[PDB]
């Protein structure tokens, strides 16, 4: 088994590295771990370095990956930028043997943002028309919106970009009131909040 | 210089430890020694396999899952076998989900859906792997392969 | 009377026999980290000067103390240890730095007199460092 | 009749009295002790012997005065001795010449002790003598008094024996130690003499004399006397046995002796009196 | 001249200097999953740190190593995590000796046992640190704490 120490990574501007833990809990398995970063389009652009980029986990061990910035301040300074951290575990008869890629969000966060991270959740707004619901995010943080309900009729999960919008499926046969939660920087659920229309 | 110890670290909600089961094939010229049911071979005995998400942090409630690998020259959705001299021909391994529908090989994240999970508890994901003909005839030879399961956390 | 005899005489105090020529005090091992602060001191050590065979007429003996002192007033450490001095006191709680004098009565029943003294080491400014401790307090007696 | 002293001082003439100053050399003799020999001290003459002769007699009532007035003895008058104070008129001495001849009178004292004495300081009275003067021309007689005064400090012996000195100072060495006391007794006739000490004492057994030292005195020490090697206590007769004309030492030596406990340094002084008796 | 007092003795070095390394240092507890905090008293694995002593007196015997600092309001034996909005609540930093037994925060000399030392030679004081639950459930976040260490020599 191969697990990551986090479901997302925040990389604040100016930081020299961020750590990501990788653990194997199986005494009899031996993997090649190959780790890299991609941009929102899923291309290896080279904005970040992972070290080590390739190594071998022999049994029950833990190795800390380190993600290094290589942007040189060329990313936006007003809002967060989305990247994807990838960790690929390859295990070393006519068998189909499988590799596991565990893939988490990597957020580049500029310094000196006005709104603090925690306050972003409650600023989320809504729009109820057609067979659709639009979510509105005026904050500079990517908001991962989960457990979205139209009454007790549960809807899709959404990822509302910073300073942007995101639309989901909606049936009018669902209930009246709206409620949601979000995944914060440490992977934890935020308190349930009342979905404010308009 | 006054003997200070600074302590730092984090407390997060983790994802899951992911373990993949390697699917095995026994065959020995099984349906192949009596195939030619058109090029659409399909119905070959499915072998099942699981992906075990255990243990899991209290975070995980939904994950985006997919398969990637070397697609078949004749079919974009079948996985290509090994293409060594000691291998079979006219065959592509198909991947089928729990409801025996075909898994879109090498699909984009926008195309994939959320598999909902039970937070805290261990979660099992079930798949099937049969062989499907892309030509006629097929021939005698090994059926080894390799593919990548992708787990994108929410 | 018929004849008056006038007899004149004098009683002069004479020197005693000094028993203790060389009194040796051993402070032993003292420890730096118990002598960092200013005013740190070692345990007192009782030392006695004994004089015997005191000729009748000598009722008091006066000890006169002499030795090399440093800028604190106390006796200088001739040894290698630094920021450390030696203090001398009587058991009645008076400091006997170089030049000072103490007098004691001679015990008539025993034809002798004794000076009960106590000696320690101390660090006035603090921060006594590693090294040896050597010091000598010379003393001469007058008689009355 | 006109007289002057050995100092050549004229003794005034009249029927009153005159103070006559004289030198005394008193002495212990066998039987009687000499107080004054006036016959080396008073000289008398007749200014007009060709025409008149003077006679002088010693009348009764002539006696010692002042500090000697309690004493009696004899008077040697012109060779012969008479009781003193005088109880009758003496025979007359003639003065029939210009040649100064002595007034032949010497006063003696009856011994009443062993070795006692009486200090007579200069300028003080010794004797009152009553003279009576007659002549060979008429039957006139008149009396006058000569008061004999001493012009030298003297000690008149009172007994049969004499001491080498009446005051003796002796110095001890520094504590402890001793010095012998020079003190001898001679009697003009072979007598049985003994002496006894006196002064301020400390202990119950009265054998150690206290320290009278005035300036910066020592403590715990006193003076104790010894002969040969025996303590001689106060108020206790010490016998010398037969003592005669040859001087005999009392054999005394002075010593330190301890009285109180703690001995302080300082000076020591004791004044001890010796008195003699016949035993 | 007629009488003399001769005093003898030695002043011995019975202690050590904190090595340059250790005058001030940091301990990284790293990432810690939130689910592992099963009830109050639950503890994460031990993270070892140490203190180096050099040079050292030729007559040292032992040290009493103590740790002071703002204590957790729910357990006084623990070091308080800083109380900011980001910080992880319901946790306290515990400190342990070489044999992994609790060294109380702010403990007096009497409570702390001695730690034997090699004389005239450099010395290493080994320790461990780890988190401990004071509330449940643990709220996830940043771990930040400082603590001064003290050395009393024998």
Instruction: Give counts: helices (H), strands (E), chain C.
Output: 0, 10
| Cα–Cα distance for residue pair A52/A32, rounded to 1 Å | 12
| Cα–Cα distance for residue pair A157/A143, rounded to 1 Å | 11
Chains touching B by CB (3 or more pairs below 8 Å): A, E
B/e letters for B135-153, b = 16+ CB within 10 Å, e = fewer, are eeebeebbbbbbbbbbbbb
Interface test with B, best of E34, E92, E125 (most B CBs within 10 A): E34
Look at C84 and E12 and tell me if their CB atoms are within 8 Å. Answer: no
Give contacts of E 57-96 with C, CB under 8 A.
57, 59
- DSSP label at D14? S
Q: Report whether D160 contacts D139 (CB < 8 A).
A: no
For residue E17, give both structure tokens. Answer: 């200097």
**Residues in Cβ contact with A190 at an 8 Å cutoff, skipping those fewer than 6 apart:** A121, A181, A182, A183, A184
| Cα–Cα distance for residue pair D257/D259, rounded to 1 Å | 7
Choose among D188, D189, D198, D276: nearest CA to D240. D276
Q: How far out from the chain centre does Cα A73 lie?
A: 21
On the CB side of D165, CA atoms within 13 Å amount to: 10
Q: How far apart are the first and last CA of chain C?
A: 38
Chain E contact for A7 (CB, 8 A cutoff): no
Please count the structural domains in chain C.
1
| Cα–Cα distance for residue pair D120/D107, rounded to 1 Å | 15
| Cα–Cα distance for residue pair A28/D145, rounded to 1 Å | 167
For residue E42, give both structure tokens. Answer: 């639950």
Choose among B143, D161, D152, B22: nearest CA to A100. B22
| Cα–Cα distance for residue pair E109/E98, rounded to 1 Å | 18
Give contacts of B 41-100 with A, CB under 8 A.
49, 51-52, 54, 57-62, 79, 93
Q: Which residues pair with D146 in a beta bridge?
A: D18, D129
Q: Report whether D196 contacts D238 (CB < 8 A).
A: yes
| Cα–Cα distance for residue pair D81/D71, rounded to 1 Å | 17
On the CB side of B69, CA atoms within 13 Å amount to: 27
- DSSP label at D40? G
| Cα–Cα distance for residue pair E57/C31, rounded to 1 Å | 10
| Cα–Cα distance for residue pair E82/E145, rounded to 1 Å | 6
Q: How far out from the chain centre does Cα D158 lie?
A: 6
- Using a CB cutoff of 8 Å and minimum separation of 24, what contacts does E20-26 make? E21/E52, E22/E50, E22/E51, E22/E52, E22/E53, E23/B1, E23/B3, E24/B1, E24/B2, E24/B3, E24/B4, E24/B5, E24/B6, E25/B5, E25/B6, E25/E49, E26/B5, E26/B6, E26/B7, E26/B8
Look at E147 and B55 and tell me if their CB atoms are within 8 Å. Answer: no
Choose among C79, C88, C91, C103: nearest CA to C138. C88
Q: Which residues pair with C122 in a beta bridge?
A: C41, C85
For residue A20, give both structure tokens. Answer: 């990501």
**Residues in Cβ contact with C72 at an 8 Å cutoff, skipping those fewer than 6 apart:** C85, C124, C125
C22: enclosing H helix or E strand: strand C22-31
- Give the torsion sign (CA, D44, D45, D47, D49): positive
Residue of E nearest to A64 (CA): E30
Choose among D121, D117, D119, D118: nearest CA to D153. D121
C142 to chain D, closest Cα gap in Å: 14
| Cα–Cα distance for residue pair D126/D67, rounded to 1 Å | 7
B/e letters for C133-143, b = 16+ CB within 10 Å, e = fewer, are bbbebbbebeb
Longest distance between any two alpha carbons in chain A, whole Å? 61
Given the structure tokens 């499988």, which residue do they identify?
A98
Which of E23, E32, E147 has the CB atom closest to B10's CB atom? E32
- DSSP label at E143? E
Choose among C86, C110, C113, C80: nearest CA to C98. C86
Using DSSP, state whether C90 is helix, strand or coil: strand
The arrangement of strands across the sheet holding E47-56 comes to E16-18, E47-56, E123-133, E91-96, E79-80
B149: enclosing H helix or E strand: strand B145-153
Q: Report whether D279 contacts D235 (CB < 8 A).
A: no
Q: Which domain holds residue B132?
A: 1-154
| Cα–Cα distance for residue pair A23/A63, rounded to 1 Å | 7
**Residues in Cβ contact with D253 at an 8 Å cutoff, skipping those fewer than 6 apart:** D178, D179, D180, D181, D225, D226, D227
Which of E31, E88, E139 has the CB atom closest to A21's CB atom? E31
Chains touching C by CB (3 or more pairs below 8 Å): D, E
Strand positions, DSSP E, chain A: 2-4, 8-12, 18-24, 30-39, 48-51, 54-58, 62-69, 81-91, 95-109, 125-129, 132-137, 143-150, 153-154, 158-160, 164-169, 178-182, 193-194
- Give the torsion sign (CA, E77, E79, E83, E86): negative
B/e letters for B32-43, b = 16+ CB within 10 Å, e = fewer, are beebeeeeebee
Interface test with E, best of A186, A189, A191 (most E CBs within 10 A): A186
Chains touching D by CB (3 or more pairs below 8 Å): C
| Cα–Cα distance for residue pair D29/D20, rounded to 1 Å | 25
| Total count of residues recorded for chain B | 154
Look at A187 and E139 and tell me if their CB atoms are within 8 Å. Answer: no
Question: How does strand E91-96 pair with strand E79-80?
Answer: antiparallel
Q: Which residues pair with A25 in a beta bridge?
A: none
**Contact residues on chain A for E139, CB-CB shorter than 8 A:** 188
Q: How far out from the chain centre does Cα C44 lie?
A: 14
| Cα–Cα distance for residue pair B35/B91, rounded to 1 Å | 11
**Cβ-based contacts under 8 A for chains B and E:** 96
DSSP letters spanning A63-75: EEEEEEE---S-S
Burial class (CB in 10 A: 0-12, 13-18, 19+), B52: middle
CA–CA distance from A84 to each of A9, A22, A35, A172, D278 (Å)?
Answer: 9, 16, 11, 35, 150
Choose among B132, B153, B146: nearest CA to B35. B132
C17: enclosing H helix or E strand: strand C17-18
| Cα–Cα distance for residue pair A147/D160, rounded to 1 Å | 157
Choose among D271, D255, D265: nearest CA to D219. D265
C85 to chain E, closest Cα gap in Å: 11
Q: Report whether A82 contacts A97 (CB < 8 A).
A: no
Choose among D43, D185, D57: nearest CA to D114. D185
C137 to chain D, closest Cα gap in Å: 30
Look at E5 and C23 and tell me if their CB atoms are within 8 Å. Answer: yes
Give contacts of D 98-117 with C, CB under 8 A.
114-117
| Cα–Cα distance for residue pair E2/C142, rounded to 1 Å | 11
| Cα–Cα distance for residue pair D132/D59, rounded to 1 Å | 6
Q: How far apart are the first and last CA of chain A?
A: 46
**Contact residues on chain C for E13, CB-CB shorter than 8 A:** 32, 130
Residue of B nearest to E145 (CA): B7
Q: Report whether C27 contacts C42 (CB < 8 A).
A: yes
Using DSSP, state whether D210 is helix, strand or coil: coil
Q: How far out from the chain centre does Cα C72 lie?
A: 18
Helices of type H across chain A: none
Q: Report whether D94 contacts D55 (CB < 8 A).
A: yes
| Cα–Cα distance for residue pair D215/D206, rounded to 1 Å | 25
Please count the structural domains in chain E.
1
| Cα–Cα distance for residue pair E50/E149, rounded to 1 Å | 11
B76 to chain A, closest Cα gap in Å: 18
- Residue D160: CB atoms within 10 Å: 24
Interface test with A, best of B55, B59, B87, B108 (most A CBs within 10 A): B59
Q: Report whether E103 contacts E66 (CB < 8 A).
A: yes
Q: Which domain holds residue C49?
A: 1-144
For residue B126, give both structure tokens. Answer: 């079930």
Q: Report whether D214 contacts C6 (CB < 8 A).
A: no
Using DSSP, state whether D279 is helix, strand or coil: coil
Look at E3 and C141 and tell me if their CB atoms are within 8 Å. Answer: yes
B37 to chain A, closest Cα gap in Å: 24
| Cα–Cα distance for residue pair B100/B42, rounded to 1 Å | 12
Chain E contact for C18 (CB, 8 A cutoff): yes
| Cα–Cα distance for residue pair C88/C99, rounded to 1 Å | 12
Chains touching A by CB (3 or more pairs below 8 Å): B, E
Q: How far out from the chain centre does Cα D2 lie?
A: 30
Using DSSP, state whether C83 is helix, strand or coil: coil
| Cα–Cα distance for residue pair D90/D104, rounded to 1 Å | 12
Look at E30 and A187 and tell me if their CB atoms are within 8 Å. Answer: no
| Cα–Cα distance for residue pair A97/B149, rounded to 1 Å | 10
Given the structure tokens 């058991």, which residue do they identify?
C91
Given the structure tokens 């034997």, which residue do they identify?
E116
Interface test with C, best of E11, E152, E153 (most C CBs within 10 A): E11
| Cα–Cα distance for residue pair C103/E88, rounded to 1 Å | 75
């Amino acid at each position: 088994g191969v697990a990551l120490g986090a479901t997302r990574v925040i990389y604040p501007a100016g930081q020299k590295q961020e750590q990501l833990a990788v653990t194997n809990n199986d005494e009899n398995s031996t993997y090649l771990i190959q780790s890299w970063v991609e941009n929102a389009d899923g291309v290896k652009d080279g904005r970040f370095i992972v070290t080590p980029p390739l190594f071998a986990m022999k049994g029950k061990k833990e190795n800390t990956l380190r993600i290094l910035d290589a942007t040189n301040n060329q990313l936006p300074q007003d809002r967060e930028s989305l990247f994807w951290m990838n960790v690929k575990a390859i295990p070393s008869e006519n068998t189909l043997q499988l590799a596991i890629i565990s893939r988490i969000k990597l957020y580049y966060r500029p310094a000196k943002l006005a709104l603090p991270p925690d306050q972003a959740a409650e600023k989320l707004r809504f729009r109820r028309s057609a067979n659709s619901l639009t979510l509105i995010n005026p904050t500079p943080y990517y908001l991962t919106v989960t457990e979205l309900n139209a009454g007790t009729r549960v809807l899709e999960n959404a990822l509302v970009p910073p300073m942007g919008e995101s639309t989901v499926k909606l049936p009018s046969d669902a209930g009246s009131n709206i409620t949601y939660r979000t995944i914060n920087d440490y992977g934890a659920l935020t308190p349930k909040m009342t979905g404010v229309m308009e | 210089a006054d003997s200070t110890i600074t302590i730092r670290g984090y407390v997060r909600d983790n994802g899951c430890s992911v373990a993949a089961e390697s699917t095995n094939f026994t065959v020995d010229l099984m349906e192949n020694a009596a195939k030619q049911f058109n090029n659409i071979g399909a119905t070959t005995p499915v072998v099942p396999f699981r992906i075990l998400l255990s243990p899991c942090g209290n975070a995980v409630s939904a994950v985006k899952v997919g398969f990637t690998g070397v697609a078949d020259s004749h079919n974009a959705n079948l996985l290509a076998l090994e293409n060594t001299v000691s291998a079979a021909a006219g065959l592509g391994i198909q991947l089928l989900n729990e409801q025996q529908n075909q898994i879109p090989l090498n699909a984009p994240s926008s195309a994939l859906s959320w598999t909902t999970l039970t937070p805290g508890k261990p979660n099992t994901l079930n798949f099937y792997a049969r062989l499907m003909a892309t030509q006629v005839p097929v021939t005698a030879g090994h059926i080894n392969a390799t593919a990548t399961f992708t787990l994108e956390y929410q | 009377a018929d004849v008056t005899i006038t007899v004149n005489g004098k009683v002069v105090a004479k020197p005693c026999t000094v028993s203790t020529t060389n009194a040796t005090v051993d402070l032993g091992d003292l420890y730096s980290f118990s002598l960092m602060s200013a005013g740190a001191a070692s345990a007192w050590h009782d030392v006695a000067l004994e004089l015997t065979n005191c000729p009748v007429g000598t009722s008091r003996v006066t000890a006169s103390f002499s030795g090399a002192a440093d800028s604190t007033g106390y006796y200088k450490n001739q040894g290698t240890a630094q920021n450390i001095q030696l203090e001398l006191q009587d058991d009645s709680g008076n400091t006997l730095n170089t030049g000072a004098t103490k007098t004691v009565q001679v015990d008539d029943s025993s034809q002798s007199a004794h000076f009960p003294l106590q000696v320690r080491a101390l660090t006035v400014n603090g921060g006594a460092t590693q090294g040896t401790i050597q010091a000598v307090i010379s003393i001469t007696y007058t008689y009355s | 009749f006109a007289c002057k002293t050995a100092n050549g001082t004229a003794i005034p003439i009249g029927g009153g009295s005159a103070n006559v100053y004289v030198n005394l050399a008193p002495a212990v003799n066998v039987g009687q002790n000499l107080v004054v020999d006036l016959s080396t001290q008073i000289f008398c003459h007749n200014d007009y012997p060709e025409t008149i002769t003077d006679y002088v007699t010693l009348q009764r009532g002539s006696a010692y005065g002042g500090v000697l007035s309690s004493f009696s003895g004899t008077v040697k008058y012109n060779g012969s001795s008479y009781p003193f104070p005088t109880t009758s008129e003496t025979p007359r001495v003639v003065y029939n010449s210009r040649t100064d001849k002595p007034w032949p009178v010497a006063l003696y004292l009856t011994p009443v002790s062993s070795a006692g004495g009486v200090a007579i300081k200069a300028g003080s009275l010794i004797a009152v003598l009553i003279l009576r003067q007659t002549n060979n021309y008429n039957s006139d007689d008149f009396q006058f008094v000569w008061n004999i005064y001493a012009n030298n400090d003297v000690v008149v012996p009172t007994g049969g024996c004499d001491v080498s000195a009446r005051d003796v100072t002796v110095t001890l060495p520094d504590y402890p130690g001793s010095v012998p006391i020079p003190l001898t007794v001679r009697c003009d006739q072979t007598q049985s003499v003994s002496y006894t000490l006196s002064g301020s004492v400390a202990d119950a057994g009265n054998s150690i004399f206290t320290n009278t030292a005035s300036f910066s005195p020592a403590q715990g020490v006193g003076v104790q006397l010894t002969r040969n090697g025996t303590i001689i206590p106060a108020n206790n007769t010490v016998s010398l046995g037969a003592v005669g004309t040859s001087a005999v030492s009392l054999g005394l030596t002075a010593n330190y002796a301890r009285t109180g406990g703690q001995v302080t340094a300082g000076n020591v002084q004791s004044i001890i009196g010796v008195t003699f008796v016949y035993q």
